[PDB]
Design a protein around this motif. Structure first.
Motif, PDB file in Angstrom:
ATOM      1  N   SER C  43       0.844  -1.185   0.000  1.00 45.36           N
ATOM      2  CA  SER C  43       0.000   0.000   0.000  1.00 45.36           C
ATOM      3  C   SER C  43       0.884   1.240   0.000  1.00 45.36           C
ATOM      4  CB  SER C  43      -0.946   0.018   1.200  1.00 45.36           C
ATOM      5  OG  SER C  43      -1.782  -1.125   1.202  1.00 45.36           O
ATOM      6  N   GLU C  44       0.523   2.194  -0.862  1.00 51.92           N
ATOM      7  CA  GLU C  44       1.259   3.447  -0.943  1.00 51.92           C
ATOM      8  C   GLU C  44       1.188   4.231   0.356  1.00 51.92           C
ATOM      9  OE1 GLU C  44       3.412   5.239  -2.118  1.00 51.92           O
ATOM     10  OE2 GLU C  44       3.325   5.624  -4.270  1.00 51.92           O
ATOM     11  N   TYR C  45       0.037   4.218   1.022  1.00 52.70           N
ATOM     12  CA  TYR C  45      -0.033   4.794   2.353  1.00 52.70           C
ATOM     13  C   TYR C  45       0.886   4.101   3.340  1.00 52.70           C
ATOM     14  CZ  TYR C  45      -1.839   7.136   6.420  1.00 52.70           C
ATOM     15  OH  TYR C  45      -1.957   7.915   7.547  1.00 52.70           O
ATOM     16  N   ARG C  46       1.006   2.778   3.283  1.00 56.92           N
ATOM     17  CA  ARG C  46       1.938   2.076   4.151  1.00 56.92           C
ATOM     18  C   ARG C  46       3.364   2.539   3.891  1.00 56.92           C
ATOM     19  NH1 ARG C  46       4.339  -2.496   4.134  1.00 56.92           N
ATOM     20  NH2 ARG C  46       3.386  -3.133   2.156  1.00 56.92           N
ATOM     21  N   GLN C  47       3.742   2.674   2.620  1.00 58.52           N
ATOM     22  CA  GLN C  47       5.093   3.129   2.306  1.00 58.52           C
ATOM     23  C   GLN C  47       5.346   4.524   2.854  1.00 58.52           C
ATOM     24  OE1 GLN C  47       5.276   1.036  -1.893  1.00 58.52           O
ATOM     25  NE2 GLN C  47       6.898   2.579  -1.772  1.00 58.52           N
ATOM     26  N   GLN C  48       4.460   5.465   2.527  1.00 60.25           N
ATOM     27  CA  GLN C  48       4.662   6.845   2.957  1.00 60.25           C
ATOM     28  C   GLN C  48       4.621   6.958   4.475  1.00 60.25           C
ATOM     29  OE1 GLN C  48       2.039   9.522   0.793  1.00 60.25           O
ATOM     30  NE2 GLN C  48       2.417   8.405  -1.109  1.00 60.25           N
ATOM     31  N   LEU C  49       3.771   6.161   5.124  1.00 56.83           N
ATOM     32  CA  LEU C  49       3.695   6.194   6.582  1.00 56.83           C
ATOM     33  C   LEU C  49       4.970   5.660   7.218  1.00 56.83           C
ATOM     34  CD1 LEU C  49       2.071   7.217   8.741  1.00 56.83           C
ATOM     35  CD2 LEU C  49       0.704   5.128   8.796  1.00 56.83           C
ATOM     36  N   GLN C  50       5.433   4.494   6.765  1.00 50.83           N
ATOM     37  CA  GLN C  50       6.640   3.926   7.345  1.00 50.83           C
ATOM     38  C   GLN C  50       7.840   4.829   7.122  1.00 50.83           C
ATOM     39  OE1 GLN C  50       6.192   0.162   5.518  1.00 50.83           O
ATOM     40  NE2 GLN C  50       4.776  -0.467   7.139  1.00 50.83           N
ATOM     41  N   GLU C  51       7.879   5.550   6.003  1.00 47.66           N
ATOM     42  CA  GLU C  51       8.973   6.491   5.777  1.00 47.66           C
ATOM     43  C   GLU C  51       9.021   7.553   6.875  1.00 47.66           C
ATOM     44  OE1 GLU C  51      11.295   7.807   3.311  1.00 47.66           O
ATOM     45  OE2 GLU C  51      11.695   5.724   2.758  1.00 47.66           O
ATOM     46  N   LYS C  52       7.871   8.159   7.178  1.00 44.70           N
ATOM     47  CA  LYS C  52       7.813   9.118   8.275  1.00 44.70           C
ATOM     48  C   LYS C  52       8.184   8.472   9.593  1.00 44.70           C
ATOM     49  CE  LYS C  52       4.192  11.105   9.294  1.00 44.70           C
ATOM     50  NZ  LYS C  52       4.888  11.435  10.569  1.00 44.70           N
ATOM     51  N   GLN C  53       7.761   7.229   9.800  1.00 43.66           N
ATOM     52  CA  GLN C  53       8.086   6.563  11.053  1.00 43.66           C
ATOM     53  C   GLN C  53       9.590   6.409  11.202  1.00 43.66           C
ATOM     54  OE1 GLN C  53       5.382   6.997  12.703  1.00 43.66           O
ATOM     55  NE2 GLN C  53       4.881   7.487  10.578  1.00 43.66           N
ATOM     56  N   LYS C  54      10.279   6.036  10.123  1.00 45.27           N
ATOM     57  CA  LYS C  54      11.737   5.958  10.185  1.00 45.27           C
ATOM     58  C   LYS C  54      12.350   7.317  10.491  1.00 45.27           C
ATOM     59  CE  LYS C  54      12.143   4.454   5.917  1.00 45.27           C
ATOM     60  NZ  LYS C  54      12.923   3.906   4.783  1.00 45.27           N
ATOM     61  N   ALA C  55      11.878   8.372   9.826  1.00 48.20           N
ATOM     62  CA  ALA C  55      12.465   9.691  10.056  1.00 48.20           C
ATOM     63  C   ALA C  55      12.268  10.146  11.503  1.00 48.20           C
ATOM     64  CB  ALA C  55      11.867  10.707   9.085  1.00 48.20           C
ATOM     65  N   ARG C  56      11.021  10.121  11.972  1.00 45.35           N
ATOM     66  CA  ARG C  56      10.717  10.587  13.317  1.00 45.35           C
ATOM     67  C   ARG C  56      11.326   9.707  14.393  1.00 45.35           C
ATOM     68  NH1 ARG C  56       6.195   9.524  14.616  1.00 45.35           N
ATOM     69  NH2 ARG C  56       6.259  10.718  16.568  1.00 45.35           N
ATOM     70  N   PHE C  57      11.386   8.398  14.188  1.00 49.21           N
ATOM     71  CA  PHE C  57      11.909   7.517  15.213  1.00 49.21           C
ATOM     72  C   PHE C  57      13.423   7.421  15.156  1.00 49.21           C
ATOM     73  CE2 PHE C  57       7.605   5.278  15.360  1.00 49.21           C
ATOM     74  CZ  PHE C  57       7.221   6.075  16.416  1.00 49.21           C
ATOM     75  N   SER C  58      14.038   7.938  14.092  1.00 51.20           N
ATOM     76  CA  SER C  58      15.482   8.110  14.092  1.00 51.20           C
ATOM     77  C   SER C  58      15.870   9.404  14.784  1.00 51.20           C
ATOM     78  CB  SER C  58      16.014   8.091  12.659  1.00 51.20           C
ATOM     79  OG  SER C  58      15.922   9.374  12.073  1.00 51.20           O
ATOM     80  N   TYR C  59      15.068  10.454  14.616  1.00 49.05           N
ATOM     81  CA  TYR C  59      15.494  11.733  15.176  1.00 49.05           C
ATOM     82  C   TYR C  59      14.947  11.982  16.578  1.00 49.05           C
ATOM     83  CZ  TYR C  59      18.057  13.553  11.241  1.00 49.05           C
ATOM     84  OH  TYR C  59      19.005  13.777  10.275  1.00 49.05           O
ATOM     85  N   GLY C  60      13.836  11.355  16.943  1.00 43.50           N
ATOM     86  CA  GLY C  60      13.241  11.536  18.247  1.00 43.50           C
ATOM     87  C   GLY C  60      12.072  12.494  18.315  1.00 43.50           C
ATOM     88  N   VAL C  61      11.759  13.202  17.232  1.00 41.97           N
ATOM     89  CA  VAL C  61      10.692  14.194  17.265  1.00 41.97           C
ATOM     90  C   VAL C  61       9.330  13.510  17.291  1.00 41.97           C
ATOM     91  CG1 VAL C  61      12.099  15.935  16.153  1.00 41.97           C
ATOM     92  CG2 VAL C  61      10.724  14.398  14.774  1.00 41.97           C
TER      93      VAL C  61
END
Lengths: 85, 113, 200, 94
Positions: C43-61
């Motif tokens: 799912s394209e929503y799954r892809q775009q969502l997981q991308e944000k999850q990686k960004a935010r959970f790498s930086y802590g925000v």
RNA sequence: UACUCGAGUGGCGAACGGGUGAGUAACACGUGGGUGAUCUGCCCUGCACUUUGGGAUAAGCCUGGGAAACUGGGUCUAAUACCGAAUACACCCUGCUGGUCGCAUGGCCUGGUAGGGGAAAGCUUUUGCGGUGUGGGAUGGGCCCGCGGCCUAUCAGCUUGUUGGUGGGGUGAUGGCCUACCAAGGCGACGACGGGUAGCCGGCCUGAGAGGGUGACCGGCCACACUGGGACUGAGAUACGGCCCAGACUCC
């Protein structure tokens, strides 16, 4: 009338109204005298008492009883009536 | 009477005023005629700045300053210019300039190396 | 508020190692849970969502903070993804982690939060402070001699620092030139999906 | 050091008054006429140019204007109710 | 004693500031003009002054009426309280008359001239404050207009001070604003007159934009102060904590 200065103002306002009413009624009486005299048609008396009524108009406007412009209007109408008649 | 006043601005703890020209009957935060200057008492030299030409014009017209405005005018010498006792003296204590970020940058580079 | 739960868990779910040097990801590369082994429809929503999850959970925000950052970057004249990454790399915690004084981003977060740092002489104990151009970051004396900070600073032979950050003295001084560009962020993952998700 | 007793008044440019052009369609009162005005206003939304008509009652002392004449007016202080306009000159008669 | 000051006379303030959105579909609001149709305390700046006289009263003292609220009479006193007169000639009228600009009434040259007239107040010796007429500023307004922003013909005719003219009245000002006479007009599918709803805006929310919804905070106007009428004082009054009347309600 709950506060002190405003009660005092009630009293002073009544006094001032009595004074202004007296002056206004005097002016009114003089104007009526002229109006009757001119409608009767005696130019002599009309002039001799028009001078008096004009003095009364000016010296009533001088006490702040009536506005200077109103006094001027009344003199103007008075003199125009006499001059025309 | 037309007077020269101050109006509150800024957040809760730190007031920041505008030197303003308005009628005496207007409210403090009300409508204004001309914004003439400003005054930040929350700073160590207490920043003050004022348009001398408009101040002189309004004073000549007949405006009446309030006490803080008169104190400010005396500080900036425009009151003294209007009346003429000492003359237009600038008693203003300007904000001390802060050393430049790039200058600290180079000094830190030099010290560490 | 911070996130305290296990860290290798989110790397497991998101398919990318975040801390970088753990063994748990390698010995368990699959997503967690009873049904982490289940085949999953795309799912394209799954892809775009997981991308944000990686960004935010790498930086802590957190989500509100990250959404505000995205709006700021979209407002900025540059490309939205580049402005995103440079804004999230202007954070004090990220700068500290990148300069080497923190063995991890959690290290940097806590060490900035407890006020072990100071930028331009002012005691700054907030992680989300955004570092600007020409800032000098120093440590305070009480933290200069403390055992864990000393260990990390003396044994600092790990991952190289980037260009715009520069440590210069044995007192562990940080100095910055410029805000990074897309070559210099060089964090994993992708920005276009991040932008499209919030454009949805 | 003694100054003048009388300070001249300040010079001000005397104000511009609105001018109107129209057709007389009711010369049937005393000293007053009724005239319409044309205008072309674009619709606020659709944008098509729309003409509208406004009836205006003017005052002419001499009664010199017939019915159906191209006339000019200017704004004036109220002369009565509903009368804020005056006949200056009958521009084109018909 | 007068440092000081209760109550009292007299000034200034009390119309600002603070509140609410009931009403109002309206020049109420927004914007842009007009005023040759107008007012403006205190503030600023010029000019000319600020002369002379007079009666009374609050407060005090004595006394009455009343449960109270309050109030009647005598006696007594002062003023920057009140009231005469002289002067003003810059002001206001009336008559005659010149020039000039117009946007027609008309304005401007403190036009010229003749006749009549229009005021003032003292205190304090200390950084000293005031009073009157008048010229000019600034300020705050008043009145008139173009254009703009709701629903509803299962609301089509409405209007007789209504539309206009003349003479008078009134106002700060023009004007059916009011009045007497004369004419019979004026507004309406570019929705009159009705009915329903609603304070208006700068703005706020949404939307790619146009647009749709909205008027919380802050800011500008408007309206109102238990309901409904009215005027007085005043530079200025919807006069919230003023007055008068009639009501509903609460209390003695």
């Amino acid at each position: 009338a709950n506060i002190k200065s405003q009660i005092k103002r009630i009293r002073t306002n009544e006094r001032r109204r009595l004074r202004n009413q007296s002056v206004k009624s005097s002016l009114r009486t003089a104007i009526r005298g002229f109006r009757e005299a001119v409608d009767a048609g005696d130019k002599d008396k009309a002039s001799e008492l028009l001078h008096a009524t004009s003095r009364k108009l000016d010296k009533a406007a001088s006490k702040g009883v009536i506005h200077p412009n109103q006094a001027a209007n009344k003199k103007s109408a008075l003199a125009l009536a006499l001059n025309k008649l | 009477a037309v007077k020269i006043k101050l109006t509150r601005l800024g957040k809760i703890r730190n007031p920041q005023y505008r030197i303003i020209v308005a009628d005496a009957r207007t409210r403090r935060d009300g409508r204004a005629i001309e914004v003439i200057g400003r005054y930040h008492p929350k700073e160590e030299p207490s920043l003050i700045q004022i348009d001398s030409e408009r101040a002189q014009y309004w004073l000549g017209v007949g405006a009446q300053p309030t006490e803080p405005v008169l104190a400010l005018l005396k500080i900036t010498g425009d009151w003294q210019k209007f009346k003429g006792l000492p003359g237009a003296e600038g008693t203003l204590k300007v904000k001390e300039p802060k050393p430049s970020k790039l200058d600290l940058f180079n000094a830190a580079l030099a010290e560490a190396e | 508020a911070r996130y305290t739960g296990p860290a290798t868990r989110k790397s497991r779910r998101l398919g990318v190692d975040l801390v970088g040097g753990d063994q748990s990801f390698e010995k368990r590369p699959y997503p967690p849970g009873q049904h982490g082994r289940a085949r999953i429809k795309e799912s394209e929503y799954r892809q775009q969502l997981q991308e944000k999850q990686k960004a935010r959970f790498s930086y802590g925000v957190m989500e509100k903070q990250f959404r505000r950052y995205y709006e700021e970057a979209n407002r900025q004249p540059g490309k939205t993804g580049d402005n995103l990454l440079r804004i999230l790399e202007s954070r004090l915690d990220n700068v500290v982690y990148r300069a080497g004084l923190a063995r991890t981003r959690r290290m940097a977060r806590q060490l900035v939060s407890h006020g072990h740092f100071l930028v331009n002489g002012v005691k700054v104990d907030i992680p989300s402070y955004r570092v600007s151009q020409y800032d000098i970051i120093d440590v305070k004396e009480k933290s200069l001699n403390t055992l864990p900070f000393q260990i990390a600073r003396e044994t600092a032979g790990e991952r190289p620092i980037p260009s715009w950050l520069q440590v210069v003295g044995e007192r562990q001084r940080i100095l910055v030139h410029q805000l990074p560009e897309r070559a210099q962020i060089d964090v994993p993952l992708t920005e276009q999906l991040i932008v499209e998700l919030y454009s949805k | 050091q003694k100054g003048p007793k009388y300070t001249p008044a300040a010079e001000k440019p005397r104000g511009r008054r609105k001018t109107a052009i129209g057709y007389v369609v009711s010369d049937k009162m005393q000293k007053t006429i009724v005239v319409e005005l044309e205008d072309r206003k674009s619709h606020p939304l659709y944008g098509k140019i729309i003409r509208t008509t406004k009836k205006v009652k003017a005052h002419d002392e001499n009664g010199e204007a017939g019915i159906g004449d191209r006339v000019s007016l200017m704004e004036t202080r109220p002369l009565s109710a509903t009368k804020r306009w005056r006949l200056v000159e009958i521009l084109e008669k018909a």
